[PDB]
Design a protein around this ligand. Sequence first.
Ligand SMILES: [Ca+2]
Ligand SMILES: [Ca+2]
Ligand SMILES: [Ca+2]
Ligand SMILES: [Ca+2]
Ligand SMILES: [Ca+2]
Lengths: 341, 345, 341, 345, 345
Amino acid sequence: SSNSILLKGCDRIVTVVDASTYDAGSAIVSIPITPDIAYRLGSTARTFQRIKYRSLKFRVNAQCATTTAGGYVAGFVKDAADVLPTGTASIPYLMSNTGSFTQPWWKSTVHNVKIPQKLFYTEAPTRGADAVREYCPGQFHVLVDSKPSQICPVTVDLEWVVELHDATFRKESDQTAISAIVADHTLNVYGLPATSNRVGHILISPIGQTPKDLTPTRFATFFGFLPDDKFCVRIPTPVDVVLTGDNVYQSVEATHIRAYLVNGGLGIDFHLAAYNDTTHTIQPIIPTLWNVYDVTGAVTAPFTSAIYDNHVWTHKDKFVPVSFQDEPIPGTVFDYLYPRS
Amino acid sequence: SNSILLKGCDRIVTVVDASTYDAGSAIVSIPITPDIAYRLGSTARTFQRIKYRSLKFRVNAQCATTTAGGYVAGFVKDAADVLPTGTASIPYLMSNTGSFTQPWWKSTVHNVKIPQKLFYTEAPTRGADAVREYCPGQFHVLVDSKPSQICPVTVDLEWVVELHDATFRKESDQTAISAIVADHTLNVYGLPATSNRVGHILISPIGQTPKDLTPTRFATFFGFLPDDKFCVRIPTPVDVVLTGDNVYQSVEATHIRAYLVNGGLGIDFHLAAYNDTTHTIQPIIPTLWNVYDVTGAVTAPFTSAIYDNHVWTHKDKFVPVSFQDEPIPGTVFDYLYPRSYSLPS
Amino acid sequence: SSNSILLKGCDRIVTVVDASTYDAGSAIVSIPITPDIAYRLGSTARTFQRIKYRSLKFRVNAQCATTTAGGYVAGFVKDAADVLPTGTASIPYLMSNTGSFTQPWWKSTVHNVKIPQKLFYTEAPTRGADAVREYCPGQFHVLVDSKPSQICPVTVDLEWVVELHDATFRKESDQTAISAIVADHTLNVYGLPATSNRVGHILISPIGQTPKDLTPTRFATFFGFLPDDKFCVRIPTPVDVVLTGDNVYQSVEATHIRAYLVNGGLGIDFHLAAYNDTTHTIQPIIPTLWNVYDVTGAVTAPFTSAIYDNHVWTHKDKFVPVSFQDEPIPGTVFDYLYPRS
Amino acid sequence: SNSILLKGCDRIVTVVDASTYDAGSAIVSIPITPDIAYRLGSTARTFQRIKYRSLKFRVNAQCATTTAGGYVAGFVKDAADVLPTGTASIPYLMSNTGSFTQPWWKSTVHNVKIPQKLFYTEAPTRGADAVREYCPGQFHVLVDSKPSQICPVTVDLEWVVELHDATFRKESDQTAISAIVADHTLNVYGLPATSNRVGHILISPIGQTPKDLTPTRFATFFGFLPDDKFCVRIPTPVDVVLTGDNVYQSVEATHIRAYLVNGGLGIDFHLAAYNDTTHTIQPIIPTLWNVYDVTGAVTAPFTSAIYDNHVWTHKDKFVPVSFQDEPIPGTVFDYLYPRSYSLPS
Amino acid sequence: SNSILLKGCDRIVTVVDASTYDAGSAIVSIPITPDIAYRLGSTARTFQRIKYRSLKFRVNAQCATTTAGGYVAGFVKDAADVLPTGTASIPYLMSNTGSFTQPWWKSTVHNVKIPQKLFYTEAPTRGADAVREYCPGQFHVLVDSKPSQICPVTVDLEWVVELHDATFRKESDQTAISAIVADHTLNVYGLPATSNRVGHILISPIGQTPKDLTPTRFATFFGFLPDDKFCVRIPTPVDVVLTGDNVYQSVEATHIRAYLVNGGLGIDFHLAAYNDTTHTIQPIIPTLWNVYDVTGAVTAPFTSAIYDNHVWTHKDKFVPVSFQDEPIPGTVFDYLYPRSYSLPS
Ligand SMILES: [Ca+2]
Ligand SMILES: [Ca+2]
Ligand SMILES: [Ca+2]
Ligand SMILES: [Ca+2]
Ligand SMILES: [Ca+2]
């Protein structure tokens, strides 16, 4: 038998590389409060089933030089399910949630939230539906009120104090979905000019001009971290691909973006990919390399040509980091392979 | 004010068959640190210091009265003391105040009066390793006399502690890893200069002649399967001497690293060190070893190389580090290089 | 017989020349708390064996103009042994230590730490192992959260109040290890082109471009102070050197960087060096000048050529100031020979 | 049980002649550890922690009632603290609590007031040597003013102690030696390359010319007689370069070993290291140094060796170890290699 | 002081397998002397007299609850008394007070009622070995009915004792060896006069033909490994007759000594005695045996020697002594010449 405890403490809850390019109404911060966010809380809360948040104090510091014009609104919505309105008019909504404050970028805010008399679970349900309100007392937002003029990186710190009950040990946290660290760029796949060399490839287009290939250095400016040869991420909505060649046809649901090796195992490039039932691994959908079973049960690579439907990804898209088996990698493993900055 | 009182219960050692262990050897010899229990560990990592109110060890042995033989348990008082590593483990362990001897079929609980001192929760990362600062002592369960038939043994720990001074740490900074088998060794030979086998790591079964380290053997030596980016910091650096035309350089092989050969089908293992040029641990092959001259330009002027012979046993501890020499964490290593799951250590 | 006392006071604990070039996650401040740091405390604590820190209040002032973007995290770890994780992810660790605060460079922080009911010694053990936790209640860090944009020098002041016991008089403090005052430079020894003039010499390479000779003025920009003709410092890890000439060979463990005279006693240069058993002094390892005993007991300088293994030192390296006898010089003597700035 | 109260009186330090001690130097400089006294140390072995209740240092100074001068004695509280090697030790020690002067003829019994802390009873066998854990401080006796005539001084200790937490230490004691006399050093030489005593250990006095070890010469440097079974671990390894017919190897001379010379009726000393082939510490001699190769065969192809020069002083700490560098017990060493009976050791 | 009351519990005898012991033979036959137990013996050393207040023998018999048979245990009061080497030991031991039978699986804690007499704490170093002075009696455990399967038995002792009259014993312990196995003897031979191994020690099994000492053969006879520094005093001297060119001397071979053979990479054993010239124990070899004469000069005129035959058995008590027949300490011998760790020794 075990006991229930009362913990106090504080952690970094979220850190942003200057998301100044984000236009008015964009949410540069919007994290749903679970023990998983904080390192220290998330370590102890891992040894309990049920948590009760008696006080959450948020500190929003923007390291934006006093010469930066513009401002923000920060605040806490007491509903896990609630999601903010489209850009421009999110500001007056968030403001109507008590404890919300409006401030110029160079000033900092402090938000004392209280959520007593409500007992949550400490993990999203593994089996069953994701009833988010069962384990989340709300989400904390920081909306850009007026676009900042210069380098404006933001940070939120939580000063928490909680009750924890019903002792049990959980597994390590899987790495959550990732989005871009910048709102003036887009990843793109173009399959149109079929005679092109890089036609199934992921490319970064500055929203303005013509798209470029994914240099790891670019990948880093877009995602925050540097890519390795086993970077695989789940795609928000599958991209249709169609293999072909010699009275053989097969359509392929492209569910991932895999990182593969470019020329004789010295470089690295990114490609639409899918789980290949031959290899039991997520592979880049190259016609000459894509193997398939036939009725006999034998493996063959009959494909020569392929056509990719175009797609676009934005800063608003959520990519899930996974292994080549489509297993969500644990957080600590991700944090190790992908140091931020 | 930050400090708490945590009660809990946890598995210390997982089920093992005592009938495979010899007389005198321990089924358990475990220094007490919060990092052994799961529940205890994962909370106490968020604290700096700790006091052990209560510790009750449960030794469960799930076998019938037919099994002959017994075990000997107890708690040593200081973490510095080291039980003699023979079959004398018994008479020594039996001398300490808390000492139980039972038949294998009889299971027991053992309460340990622990000095009410505040220990640190973690070993020192900096300065000297004053072991008595963070460990109140080791718990032991020895094999007095081998069990006559299959007797499986487990150890649970009913713990109650106080935790103080709030901090945070992860599972483990690094990991150490030794061999699983004791009748082999790993070797580097550079003695027959002209051989294409020099510098490469090999597996000698102590009596037998040495042969090339291939994944299948690697498994049986280390417990897990190697790969492209397996790298390890060796305990003793190995001297290596590169040369060319008007050129000479001494290079301490600080790592054993995996690299890929004949197009990337197979992988071999070679002495290695951090290359100041590339900022990565590299296999120290003369033609491929790059060096700055005084002008800041990179050359690869080396053509010959001499490796000093060295040997490694089941006693040698190797530490996995990624290239760039960043030592790789425990949780992460077990994920990238998985062995069989045994709980103690 | 003597008495035990209760002292209060304050001193400068550490002062930094703008360490703005230090990238995110670098620790521009990380000093382990001992009486040796403070002048005034360190003077009285010198007359006592055992100290008990009842309150430590730190004041972090950055003199970084309000136009400087970026920020920092300061805080106190209550463990002498604990050492922070590698760069990027040190920030969330330090933050989880209570009393830690995140702030833009142009703002200041204040940290009230309490460590009562713990009695420390007032000096690192002279004989025995360096059990750091015996005489150190923890270390104070200032981590760069976001690299500052302009000249950002930092200072920490301590406002301490302590108990002192068991009276005894100690020797003067030896000068502690030194590191560079800048993270965009590296000292280097290159021995490769053996026909080169300056091949055993210490040189400063801007991480970017080709390495330069050590002008005292450069030495100052790297180390903080100006070199004298008896600057000798212990090297973190020995550099292998190999003397030779005429059927005579000898390898030499280069343990120091000595400052020697360049041309007819008017200039000064820096060289790999070792303790020469002939002269009983640490000398620059020049082949023609390196003397050795032979079996007869007679001194001879048979060496003509030499080969130095390359090495690199960084801002992260710790050099120990020593005399030519490898004696650690006392702090006051160092402070006199090497005025800062 | 698990607790006792133990009283007794033993000899802490045997006779010393203060008349031969430079002003300011200590004639007694002794850390308090239970092993310091014969009855205490033997019983304290059967426990883990200890509290020094009362410690009374009986300083028996027996100089003639004419002989002028005096001594300063005291008890410095910190174990790890070390007095200055000069005349300034006295004004330093007088600054310590409970410090005093008294003329050489006057014996005193100084009562020390030890903190009521529990110390560990033994130097830590695992981990680092944190002296502060198991020693409440040092007891000193300096020569204030060098005596004129013979000045015999001894010390006894009236002790009473609590011994707690009962466990038995093996105790696998290990000794570490240094030179007895400091008026000369012993050293190796690499040059000339042609000589016969190259890599051989020699004693070089202040008088420059080195000389082999008689070994009655060895006797005067260490304080005991050698033995063909003598081996010692070096504080700093010495680089030795073996070479032969198209072969080359670097070797760390980690030991000084004694070996039989020209038909076994002689003994000399040489640089040595663990030989991986022989599984023992051998003298690094080219023709006698065997090595494996890629095939697994043993070979002695080496014809010459280049030893680096290296000196050793009184300051250097040697450690005796049987071949295969196995630590020798305190009582075994003191038997095989007996130094003049002194106290403390 | 000068008196204490000491309590504790140690291991009296380690595991024995009763299943390999002929009926009536003792698996435990142990005289009670403070050194018998690790904590007791160490402290009892710092006193002179002792009173055994309570002695409780914890007999841990762990045989399977099926294995049939039983054991008889008891405590014979006289130290010097010795049980009969037969099956009649049981009816004899049952006749002793406080004697009992119990089946092999059943462990008991037998409390012994010791006379309230003070015994000396140590075997007398000067004078004769009156065992009755310092031993209150023996504790026995006979095999009543030979067990079927493996039958592990141990013993522990709950002891409480008064220790009186406080003085410290050196203690200059001295060991005495006998053969471990009795299935064969070692012997000397004098005939034929022409042979090479005459006067040499040899091992003669039940199988008649003698053989030299491998010395892994020596290992099986004594229970430990030899060493060129091995010397031993013989229970009964052996007459050796040296002779040469008109000279004749009689010699008592008082020792068996190990000596280097054919260039020192070998070892053999030979009859020996103290040589008055050399002041050491040398192998009695004609050409190597030196003697004085009326003038004071040393001479080796002897050309042949006649050794008398002599055998040695398990019964014969050897005593190890360094050259010059100086007794070797218990802890020194056990180190140099280690036998398998057993208890009692
Ligand atoms: Ca849950
Ligand atoms: Ca810690
Ligand atoms: Ca001190
Ligand atoms: Ca101990
Ligand atoms: Ca006695």
